[PDB]
Ligand binder design. Structure first.
Ligand SMILES: [Cl-]
Ligand SMILES: [Cl-]
Ligand SMILES: [Mg+2]
Ligand SMILES: [Mg+2]
Ligand SMILES: [Mg+2]
Ligand SMILES: [Mg+2]
Ligand SMILES: [Mg+2]
Ligand SMILES: [Mg+2]
Ligand SMILES: [Mg+2]
Ligand SMILES: [Mg+2]
Ligand SMILES: [Mg+2]
Ligand SMILES: [Mg+2]
Ligand SMILES: [Mg+2]
Ligand SMILES: [Mg+2]
Ligand SMILES: [Mg+2]
Ligand SMILES: [Mg+2]
Ligand SMILES: [Mg+2]
Ligand SMILES: [Mg+2]
Ligand SMILES: [Mg+2]
Ligand SMILES: [Mg+2]
Ligand SMILES: [Mg+2]
Ligand SMILES: [Mg+2]
Ligand SMILES: [Mg+2]
Ligand SMILES: [Mg+2]
Ligand SMILES: [Mg+2]
Ligand SMILES: [Mg+2]
Lengths: 99, 189
RNA sequence: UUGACCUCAAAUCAGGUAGGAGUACCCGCUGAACUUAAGCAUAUCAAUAAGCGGAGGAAAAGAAACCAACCGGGAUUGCCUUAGUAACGGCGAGUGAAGCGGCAAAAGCUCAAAUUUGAAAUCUGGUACCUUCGGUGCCCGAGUUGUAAUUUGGAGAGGGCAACUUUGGGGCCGUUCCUUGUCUAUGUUCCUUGGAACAGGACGUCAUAGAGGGUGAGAAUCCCGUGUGGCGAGGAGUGCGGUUCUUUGUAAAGUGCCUUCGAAGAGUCGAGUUGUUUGGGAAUGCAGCUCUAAGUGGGUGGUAAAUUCCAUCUAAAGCUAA
RNA sequence: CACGGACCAAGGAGUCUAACGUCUAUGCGAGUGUUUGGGUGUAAAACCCAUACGCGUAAUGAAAGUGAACGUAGGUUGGGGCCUCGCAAGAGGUGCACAAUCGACCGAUCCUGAUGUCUUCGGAUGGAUUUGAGUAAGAGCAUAGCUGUUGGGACCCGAAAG
RNA sequence: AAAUAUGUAAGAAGUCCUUGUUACUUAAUUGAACGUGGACAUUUGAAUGAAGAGCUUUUAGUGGGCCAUUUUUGGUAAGC
């Protein structure tokens, strides 16, 4: 990550003696904690599953995980959120009846 | 409406602009008000210098990065290296900025030196209240000015290695442009 | 039967509070057309006038879910500039910001989410007394469906080790400021004109006072004032210059090192669609309806999409002078 | 035999502003502009000043980008003035500004494709009835004035409407 | 096939003698174009005139016309 010392190119810019700033605690805002993991797991057992999550599980078993992502994209927003949701359903399927 | 050889003009006066005309008749009056306000503030704050000490930082952007100017406040790391806490620094006349970070050793060392020189040039009156009467200096920026760091010596020996600066710049542009396509061809093979 | 709890009522019950006015400037809602385009419907006039709701001496904004792509900057507001520029536009008429740079002014912060659990440690009211913008004792009540202490991401917390550093709350006298009173120089001496000398002429005086006004015509010196100083009277604000009464306290705060941890806001973000708006252009903000998340997550990075990286902040809670 | 005018007094119509074209005056000049602001003051005056910023000093492409001397900064024709000779008339020399023309240089476009290669990069060299608001010993910046331009009630008074 | 109108020329940026350049042109130093050097002065190439000639910037008003002689179209003609 050292600059070349010239005005153009991949690593353009002046070369200065580098320092490592101390990490900022605000950069860990979305980090799971032991207390938070316990509450979320307990709530899932109590509340159960959403109606759109029930039909996603059926599509995974009957029509594969590719069509599940297409439906999950529709109910949710971005396609990147559909990837995570389908992944969670697969873990639920593994721990529901497979094992 | 359009005649003769004249430049095209764009004068934006198709709204009710006359209702929003501001003439600064009080330019001289406000200068007196500001000078009066500064004088009465100096008398209120004892011998305090009316302004806080500021660090030296590099201006952003390629256009202005050749200069140093005054920043908002010293970082937590700079304050700690000077040998005091941030809370005490605020009450002693030093500006502290928690969101600025240190990544350059030259800037960090210079701001450490400014804090050390500031501490050796001030007198802190005790909380007892005896309060010896010292003369008030109205500015800390003038007492501790900011100078552009030195860059190079006046004269030096010519060292030419036979390379071309123009060729070096051209090759640097070429490498960046075709880096993506070269990697794809290498990966596909 | 009797006694609680929950929810919902009544009283000319005890104590309070809101309305209306003003509205130059300030925070929102709602919302035109004349006009310009040499016609005209998008556009423009204009996110304006009229209409409605709500404040203060300022309001609002404000301690980054920012700007950036640099050797990075660092709450907000305003001025100079960026710039009639990027961009929008029957790409016509027209419209039109922002980052950097100089300057004025500078100020920082706190809740929710943790068991005080060897002791709800908190608070309204009533009553008696007192040093009365409040204090103390006692008694009901509120409150565990959570009131205090402790901790707000810059961190920080629970244990272990070794160390030093620093006080709090009132009287009185002065100062600072404002509202006021009083004192503090020198010709009306002669001649002419005139109803009137404050005019003309001669000879003097004061001046840190020859600003202004009055008095029978142009008055420094006739009167009030003006200039420079002195001496009083009544309050506000504790900003502080000295003195004086209380030890607050087995109280509070800061700093080194080891280890285990490190809770951070949901019909919300985001997405589709419709309308409106913006310079914001595969859509800038706002709102309705439908769908509706995550926790190495989430937002942003000004061309839609898939894949791989990087940078930068920490939303959906709150206060704050110039 | 078109319209206004019975009479008199007073009032009664090209203004100011933002941004500009030409010309002229003034200061300085490859620079120029003190007045956002600071200092200072006999206090809205006068006097003094740092850093920036604007314009100018480089152009040309949609853009990535590249970027102005073969030579006394070229040749030729015409040129005021000056120089030499001459009584003069003239002849010769040198010739700024300016006018015409042929070249050279920089960018764009269309071609040629050397030494060398992350074998596709690199683009040397030499051309073309093509093209530019360019270079070729800088001229601009600021203030002021008449005249002209555009937006503004816009020289003054006047609709039927909305 | 007129009259009246109308283009060009009447010199120095001209004529002549000699010979330099080129990637154009010729069978060819042939030609073309542009030049070096030499010769010819203002009866220097007809007339008359010439409040001097050349050149640049900027801007006002105007963009309803009408009449007479001659030529001439429509119309019986018209102050059409
Ligand atoms: Cl669109
Ligand atoms: Cl280009
Ligand atoms: Mg952060
Ligand atoms: Mg009552
Ligand atoms: Mg408002
Ligand atoms: Mg129109
Ligand atoms: Mg019209
Ligand atoms: Mg109309
Ligand atoms: Mg209104
Ligand atoms: Mg009030
Ligand atoms: Mg104020
Ligand atoms: Mg406020
Ligand atoms: Mg914060
Ligand atoms: Mg800022
Ligand atoms: Mg608009
Ligand atoms: Mg609306
Ligand atoms: Mg567009
Ligand atoms: Mg787009
Ligand atoms: Mg607020
Ligand atoms: Mg008429
Ligand atoms: Mg009449
Ligand atoms: Mg008159
Ligand atoms: Mg008049
Ligand atoms: Mg005028
Ligand atoms: Mg209409
Ligand atoms: Mg006309």
């Amino acid at each position: 990550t050292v600059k070349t010392g010239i005005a153009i190119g991949l690593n353009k810019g002046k070369k200065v003696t580098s320092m490592t700033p101390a990490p900022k605690i605000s950069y860990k805002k979305g980090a799971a904690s032991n207390r938070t993991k316990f509450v979320r797991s307990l709530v899932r057992e109590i509340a159960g599953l959403s109606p759109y999550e029930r039909r996603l599980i059926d599509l995974i078993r009957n029509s594969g995980e590719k069509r599940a992502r297409k439906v999950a994209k529709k109910r949710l927003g971005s396609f990147t959120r559909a990837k995570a949701k389908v992944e969670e359903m697969n873990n639920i399927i593994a721990a529901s009846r497979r094992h | 409406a359009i005649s003769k050889n004249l430049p095209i003009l764009k004068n934006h006066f198709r709204k009710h602009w006359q209702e929003r005309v501001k003439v600064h008749f009080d330019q001289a009056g406000k200068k007196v008000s500001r000078r009066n306000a500064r004088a009465t503030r100096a008398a209120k704050i004892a011998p305090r210098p009316l302004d806080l000490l500021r660090p030296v930082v590099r201006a952003p952007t390629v256009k202005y990065n050749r200069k140093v100017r005054a920043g908002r406040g010293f970082t937590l790391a700079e304050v700690k290296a000077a040998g005091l806490t941030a809370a005490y620094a605020r009450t002693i006349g030093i500006a502290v900025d928690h969101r600025r970070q240190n990544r350059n050793q030259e800037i960090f060392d210079a701001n450490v030196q400014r804090l050390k020189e500031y501490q050796s040039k001030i007198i802190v009156f005790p909380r007892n209240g005896k309060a010896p009467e010292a003369e008030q200096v109205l500015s800390a920026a003038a007492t501790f000015p900011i100078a552009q760091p030195a860059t190079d010596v006046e004269a030096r020996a010519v060292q030419d290695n036979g390379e071309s600066a123009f060729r070096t710049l051209r090759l640097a542009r070429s490498e960046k442009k075709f880096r993506g396509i070269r990697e794809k061809r290498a990966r596909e093979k």
